Design a protein around this ligand. Structure first.
Ligand SMILES: [Zn+2]
Ligand SMILES: [Zn+2]
Ligand SMILES: [Zn+2]
Lengths: 149, 71, 1168, 105
RNA sequence: ACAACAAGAAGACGCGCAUCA
RNA sequence: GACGCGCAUCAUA
């Protein structure tokens, strides 16, 4: 948090330590690792270092399914910090997996994350929306973007 | 309860949000994005031989109820 | 892997145009708004010309623009509504020549959203309040006042939200010193999304509500709600109070309605239709934009339809009510986005696609022969279009807005490259050629014997506004001439130039000084000869003439000083400076009108050491300073707009040094390898220099900035000024053994253009390798071909004859004989699935057409290629992809065809060979390895030449979406999918199959692509994003590809090409956009320079915020984060920054502004 | 204050007023209670600025001696363009502390 | 009268274990 | 569900 833009050179050093800490061994360690990820992602924004930042998302994402308010708050903060650093496309791709899952709690969690991503940078989601084929009754195809000059 | 940003905002969904509502919301957002930008409007008005005013009027008409009737 | 963004051409697409008294003087000005660039321009009533005076980038999308003034004020404040979540107010300072922010209020998130205000902006005509609104659910009103300090203030916003409302337009209603009123076209949709039966979508009329601002109560409340019978598009404000009734005008389909709150009834008036219209009668008619001329005596309105017809709306009103609406046909102009009716009869037409026009109102159309129209007539009206005869064209601007295809190549015999842009839309489309330099126009041609080497431009008197004499000197003799608009040889000038004259100056009030190697003779207007014989057998070398001093130089490095004494004779000083070198070139500056005389002197030597000599008699002919020079100088000059010293050398280098007793800064650039002479010229009332090289060079000072651009002309040997009745401001430049006259009318900073008219919109074109021709394919939607138009006209004539009015219808012959111009009156737009295609062979050197091929009514061309097959010999083939009955929104294809041509007579004729059917429209055609690969829909096929039809060899079906582009190199082919980014496929020769091995991870709406090298591909995007994709080193020819570059230009890019622009320079990635701008990407040369540029960008991001309060980093990361790209537009704004802030930045960077400017300009000079 | 989940922001249209901070909380961020890199100024709605509420502190409510600021992270996340950060809830902790302080003395 | 203040010490949480019905 | 103990979180005051 303090160094800010100087964290782009030491990001490689703490990656194995964060990888080890993010493992499901204790709640406090995962919360602190999520806070570290959030602060680092916020600091390094604007330099183009998503090659190592994308690796930590694969470990942050499995920690969302938690019930403790502190750990879920930390995970939500980490996800919102990573959203500006990695781009909304990856977050949207992750969220579109179980958005309409038959269960209820997972749907609630995914919809909360989708709303959080939707409130900020709403206009940027136009180009990242997936293509959905129309059914017999309705038309779900956006034909305006298929024009060719 | 610090979820005031989600409830007050328009377009945010929840568990009981159907597919049709999400599709129509994203269609309206796409139409608004098309209208806001100028180069996208130029591309649309060059692809089909029309005018900017005609394209804007057509986009106004298409915003009433896209994706057909609800089920 | 770090790039740098440079910009050559700016966008020329006008979106919003406003007029007012922004400077505060008595002259009107126009503030035009581009997509992201704010520009200010004013017309000149004297010469009828338009010139730009300010151009500042705001780094954001300007969604709205309005102007207003306070109660009793004399200045106009600009209100700008942009894509950011804030509203700003701007003021123009004539002294500073910059835009100054007055206020800044934030009301929501940034970016183009749905419930964020900024789309619609309305202001109170009195100037007491402003309104901003969104598309849905959110409206805001700001109250403006002024304090005792005569400074504009603002209050808290007032909420006017309304759930489930779709606003079409917002406009302010003019009232007389009452509560402000705003009229909007609200529309509800809550019930339309509840009933699934479907009738809720229909019979849902929109209302017209009025909003009242209660100043005493400090809140906004809805007053009325009036449903409309039909759908309207926009509203017009009728002036109220003491000048006209208060109300609004609603424009709709084929109708116009006046409406006012209270007891005022509604008035409905139909829109006139063109006589014998060939368009589909089902098509309607609407208005595009409107203007207003609030004359003190009586006011009217101007409106434009879809076809460009201008009408004149006049309202006749009673004491309180309005009686009828009168319409009158005014003229016809190309379709525009907005009009600005200035004072003194100036009409500005800002076309949406093409050039911009300025019209002078010569007549008001009073008591015209043609009748008018009104709503009182029962029951549909018709009028006959005719030539203008009411407006006179004065000025034309230039705008390359509809850039659709570009191709940089060297087609002419000259070694310099040229740019070929297929711009234009509709019948006004043209193919333009861009060349770097200034516009050269020939004024006169004269052949004279001998070897001319010098000419002179001397006025009769120092106060004369025109030239008097022209002197032409040769190697052996001289040719004295005079100008009288019938230029001939003069004899009574009294010169007797038997010897070649070295100089002809204007020393006295009306006297001349001649220099010859045999002595010095003074030529006074009075018959007096003050001849000074040269002591000894030595001769003269050079001279330094002036308005009060004449400095000569003798052999052996000796200087003789002469001064023009007020008594009337010349005297010589008693000191002669001696040097150890030879005189080569020395120059003297002009006398200042205010001060006594010049003081600094420049002396060149073979030793390459310049010496400054003071002209004061106390210390005359004494050295001051020294400076080393790499090579022997050729010429010297002293330019004055803080003077600068120009150094000319016998080789191709031009050097500039700031005026200073001691040596200082030195900026130089390549000019070459030829002697260079710098001559003074006067452009726009300011001095400038002109040098000679392989190409002519001009260095002028525009807007307190020095430009260095060449001339698009052949070599020359001497230059001088020109002033006469035919051309008050010209240039006399002699040529090889002849006399020629040149002039500069247009500013012509960069990219001179010549337009060759076409008939349709050019989609794509190719270049014939052998004959160096062009094969252009064109296609338009909702268009008719020649045969269809002819048959429709014949059918209309037959119907008119069948009408048989009482036989007595003699108009058929006149209708069939007389036709309107296509390029001025537009084109007949009729149909929904109609198309039109024309294939043309064009010589790029000239404008003539070599061959023309026309297709069927329902055939659309989309691809073209030139290929050679291995089975045949040296045959050249042309393949065209043809569609059949395309419907745009409900997409459906009824087949496709591929045309084959023989190309007989090495590219001067095309003949039909055979056709072949395909199951889907072909989008891309790419030849490789002696065969042709054609993409049919989402399938990839390989074809071969056949006697009957093309024979398919290989087929692939693993492409997910519609193929939009194919690029081939070596043995690998890159497929550009419509929604996915890229696909890599390899072709097997022995086994004959296509296999996919590499793909991309992020979907991208790719429009075009280019291949920088074997493994790097540069893509594009519909929204403006530019990305670079590289394959991982560990790949087997599943395997994803990495991205090494991301950026957001902010404009749609439709072309990419890596090539060299100027000779002797490195390669660059040139891209052209759909708005008219041209930019390049430049890699860095070292790491220290990259670090310095990064530090400058970081400092200016916070220290110099953008004009509209939009974050630069967030704007450039509009869709994807920025990667290894440095924005040059922000870095180049350091020159307009405040001097104290510039200093602070310099000592923050531990450098100096003179060095920073040179460092910034070096990267632009090297690569451009 | 993120520490207390029961606190509720005013969340209304911000006006032209300027927020104030007391001596107890001088450099704290109004959202995340940070201590580094102040970025922008805090604005509050006209409802929070009327009579006895003019010049009061934003978080706790003491006399105003310094202006409120947003940190750089909040500005980057664009959390400032939400509304007035003034806390309208009294808070169950402060009143309870006052209640078991008064009885004891 | 609507009117905010003083340091005998407190606000939200979670993870594990013993006994009983 | 009831009577208890231990550990740990929020730059909590
Ligand atoms: Zn508030
Ligand atoms: Zn406080
Ligand atoms: Zn903060």
């Amino acid at each position: 948090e303090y160094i800010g833009e100087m964290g782009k050179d030491y990001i490689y050093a703490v990656t194995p330590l964060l990888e080890d800490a993010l493992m499901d061994r204790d709640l406090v360690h995962r919360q602190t690792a999520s806070a570290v990820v959030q602060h680092m992602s916020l600091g390094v924004y604007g330099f183009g270092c998503e090659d190592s930042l994308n690796h930590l998302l694969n470990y942050v994402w499995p920690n969302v399914f938690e019930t403790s308010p502190h750990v879920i708050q930390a995970v939500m903060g980490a996800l919102e910090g990573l959203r500006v650093a990695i781009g909304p496309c990856r977050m949207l791709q992750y969220c579109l997996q179980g958005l309409f899952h038959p269960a209820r709690k997972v749907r609630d969690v995914y919809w909360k994350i989708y709303n959080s991503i939707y409130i900020g940078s709403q206009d940027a989601l136009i180009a990242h929306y997936p293509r959905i084929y129309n059914d017999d009754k309705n038309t779900y195809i956006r034909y305006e973007l298929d024009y060719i000059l | 309860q610090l979820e005031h940003l989600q409830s007050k905002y328009i377009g945010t969904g929840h568990a009981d949000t159907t597919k049709w509502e999400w599709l129509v919301n994203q269609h309206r957002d796409s139409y608004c994005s098309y209208m806001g930008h100028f180069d996208l409007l130029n591309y649309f008005a060059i692809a089909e031989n029309e005018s900017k005013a005609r394209v804007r009027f057509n986009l106004m008409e298409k915003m009433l109820q896209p994706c057909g009737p609800p089920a | 892997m770090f790039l740098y963004n440079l910009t050559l051409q700016r966008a020329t697409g006008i979106s919003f145009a406003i007029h007012g008294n922004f400077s505060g003087t008595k002259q009107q000005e126009i503030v035009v708004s581009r997509g992201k660039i704010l520009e200010l321009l004013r017309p000149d009533p004297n010469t009828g010309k338009v010139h730009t005076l300010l151009t500042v980038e705001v780094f954001g999308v300007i969604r709205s623009l309005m102007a207003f003034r306070l109660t009793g004020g004399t200045k106009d404040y600009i209100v700008v509504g942009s894509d950011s979540g804030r509203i700003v107010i701007l003021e123009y300072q004539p002294s500073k020549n910059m835009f100054e922010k007055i206020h800044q209020e934030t009301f929501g998130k940034s970016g183009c959203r749905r419930i964020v205000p900024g789309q619609f902006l309305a202001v109170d005509p009195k100037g007491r309040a402003v309104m901003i609104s969104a598309i849905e659910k959110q409206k805001l009103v700001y109250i403006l006042n002024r304090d005792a300090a005569a400074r504009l203030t603002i209050s808290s916003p007032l909420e006017a939200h309304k759930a489930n409302t779709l606003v079409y337009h917002v406009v302010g209603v003019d009232v007389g010193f009452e509560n402000p009123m705003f009229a909007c076209l609200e529309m509800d949709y809550e019930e339309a999304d509840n009933d699934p039966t479907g009738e809720a979508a229909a019979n849902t009329q929109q209302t017209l509500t009025f909003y009242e601002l209660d100043l005493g109560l400090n809140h906004v409340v809805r007053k009325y709600s009036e449903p409309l019978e039909e759908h309207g598009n926009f509203l017009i404000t009728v002036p109220g109070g003491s000048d006209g009734p208060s109300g609004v005008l609603i424009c709709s389909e084929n109708y116009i309605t006046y409406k006012n709150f209270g007891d005022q009834p509604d008035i409905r008036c139909p829109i006139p239709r063109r006589r014998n219209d060939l368009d589909d009668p089902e098509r309607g008619m609407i208005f595009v934009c409107s203007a207003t001329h609030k004359t003190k005596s009586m006011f009217f309105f101007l409106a434009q339809t879809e076809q460009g017809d201008i009408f004149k709306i006049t309202l006749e009103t009673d004491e309180d009510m309005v009686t009828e609406i009168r319409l009158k046909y005014f003229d016809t102009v190309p379709v525009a986005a907005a009009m600005c009716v200035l004072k003194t009869g100036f009409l500005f037409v800002a076309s949406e696609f093409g050039n911009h026009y300025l019209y002078q109102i010569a007549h008001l159309g009073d008591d015209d022969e043609e009748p008018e129209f009104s709503s009182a007539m029962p029951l549909t009206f018709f009028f006959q279009p005719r030539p203008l005869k009411n407006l006179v064209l004065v000025d034309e601007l230039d705008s390359l807005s509809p850039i659709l295809f570009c191709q940089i190549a060297d087609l002419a015999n000259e070694d310099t490259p040229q740019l070929y842009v297929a711009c234009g839309r509709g019948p006004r489309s043209s193919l333009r050629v861009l060349r770097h330099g200034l516009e050269v126009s020939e004024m006169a041609v004269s052949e004279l014997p001998g070897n001319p080497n010098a000419v002179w431009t001397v006025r009769r008197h120092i106060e004369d506004e025109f030239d008097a004499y022209i002197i032409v000197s040769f190697v052996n003799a001289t040719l004295v001439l005079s100008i009288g608009e019938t230029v001939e040889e003069v004899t009574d000038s009294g010169f007797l130039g038997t010897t070649p004259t070295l100089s002809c100056s204007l020393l006295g009030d009306d006297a001349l000084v001649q220099v010859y190697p045999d002595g010095i003779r003074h030529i006074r207007a009075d018959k007096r000869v003050n001849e000074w014989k040269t002591p000894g057998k030595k001769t003269i070398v050079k001279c330094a003439v002036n308005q009060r001093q004449v400095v000569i130089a003798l052999t052996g490095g000796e200087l003789v000083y002469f001064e023009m004494d007020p008594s009337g004779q010349l005297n010589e000083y008693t000191e002669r400076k001696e040097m150890s070198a030879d005189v080569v070139c020395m120059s003297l500056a002009n006398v200042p009108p205010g001060e006594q005389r010049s003081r600094f002197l420049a002396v060149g030597l073979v030793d390459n050491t310049v010496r400054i000599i003071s002209l004061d008699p106390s210390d005359c002919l004494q050295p001051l300073s020294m400076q080393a020079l790499p090579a022997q100088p050729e010429s010297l000059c002293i330019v004055e707009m803080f003077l600068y010293l120009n150094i000319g050398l016998q080789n191709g280098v031009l050097l500039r040094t700031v005026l200073d007793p001691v040596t200082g800064d030195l900026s130089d650039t390549r000019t070459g390898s030829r002697p260079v002479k710098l001559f003074r010229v006067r452009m726009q009332g300011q001095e400038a220099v002109l040098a000679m090289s392989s190409r002519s060079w001009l260095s002028y000072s525009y807007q307190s900035r020095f430009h260095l651009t060449p001339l698009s002309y052949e070599t020359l040997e001497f230059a001088s000024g020109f002033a006469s009745e035919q051309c008050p401001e010209g240039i006399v430049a002699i040529s090889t053994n002849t006399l020629r006259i040149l002039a500069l009318e247009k500013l012509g900073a960069v990219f001179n253009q010549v337009a060759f008219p076409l008939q349709y919109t050019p989609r794509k074109f190719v270049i014939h390798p052998e004959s160096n021709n062009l094969i252009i394919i064109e296609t338009d939607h909702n268009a008719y071909t020649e045969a269809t138009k002819a048959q429709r006209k014949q059918q209309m004539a037959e119907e008119m004859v069948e009408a048989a009015g009482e036989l007595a219808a003699e108009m058929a012959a006149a209708f069939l004989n007389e036709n309107l111009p296509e390029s001025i009156f537009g084109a007949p737009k009729a149909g929904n699935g109609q198309w039109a295609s024309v294939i043309r062979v064009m010589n790029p050197i000239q404008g003539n057409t070599l061959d023309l091929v026309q297709l069927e009514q329902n055939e659309a061309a989309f691809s073209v290629a030139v290929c050679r097959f291995s089975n045949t010999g040296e045959d050249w083939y042309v393949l065209v992809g043809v569609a059949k009955d395309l419907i745009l929104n409900p997409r459906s294809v009824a087949g496709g065809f591929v045309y084959t041509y023989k190309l007989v007579n090495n590219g001067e004729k095309l003949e039909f060979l055979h056709k072949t059917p395909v199951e889907e429209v072909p989008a891309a055609i790419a030849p490789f390895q002696g065969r042709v690969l054609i993409g049919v829909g989402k399938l990839l096929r390989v074809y071969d030449l056949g006697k009957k039809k093309l024979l398919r060899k290989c087929e692939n079906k693993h492409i997910a979406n519609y193929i939009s582009g194919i690029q081939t190199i070596g043995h690998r082919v890159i497929v550009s999918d419509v929604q996915e980014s890229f696909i890599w496929v390899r072709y097997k020769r022995n086994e004959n199959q296509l296999i996919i091995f590499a793909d991309d991870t992020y979907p991208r709406w790719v429009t075009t692509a280019s291949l920088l090298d074997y493994d790097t591909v540069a893509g594009a995007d519909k929204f403006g994003n530019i990305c670079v994709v590289r394959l991982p080193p560990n790949t087997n020819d599943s395997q994803k590809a990495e991205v090494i570059m991301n950026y957001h230009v902010g404009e749609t890019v439709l072309s990419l090409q890596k090539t060299t622009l100027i000779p002797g320079g490195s390669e660059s990635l040139v891209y052209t956009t759909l708005s008219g701008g041209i930019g390049i990407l430049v890699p860095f040369t070292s790491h220290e320079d990259h670090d310095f540029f990064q530090h400058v960008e970081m400092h200016l991001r916070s220290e110099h915020p953008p004009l509209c309060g939009r974050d630069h980093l967030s704007f450039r990361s509009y869709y994807f984060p920025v990667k290894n790209v440095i924005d040059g537009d922000l870095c180049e704004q350091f020159n307009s920054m405040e001097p104290n802030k510039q200093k602070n930045v310099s000592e923050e960077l531990d450098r100096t502004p003179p060095e920073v400017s040179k460092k910034l300009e070096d990267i632009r000079t090297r690569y451009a | 204050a993120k520490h207390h989940p029961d606190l509720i922001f005013c969340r209304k249209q911000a006006g032209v007023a300027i927020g104030r901070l007391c001596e107890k909380c001088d450099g704290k961020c109004v959202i995340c209670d940070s201590y580094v890199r102040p970025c922008t100024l805090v604005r509050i709605c006209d409802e929070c600025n009327y009579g006895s509420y003019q010049g009061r502190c934003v978080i706790c409510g003491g006399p105003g001696v310094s202006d409120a600021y947003y940190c750089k992270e909040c500005t980057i996340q664009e959390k400032d363009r939400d509304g007035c950060p003034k806390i309208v809830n009294l808070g169950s902790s402060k009143t309870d502390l006052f209640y078991e302080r008064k009885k004891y003395g």
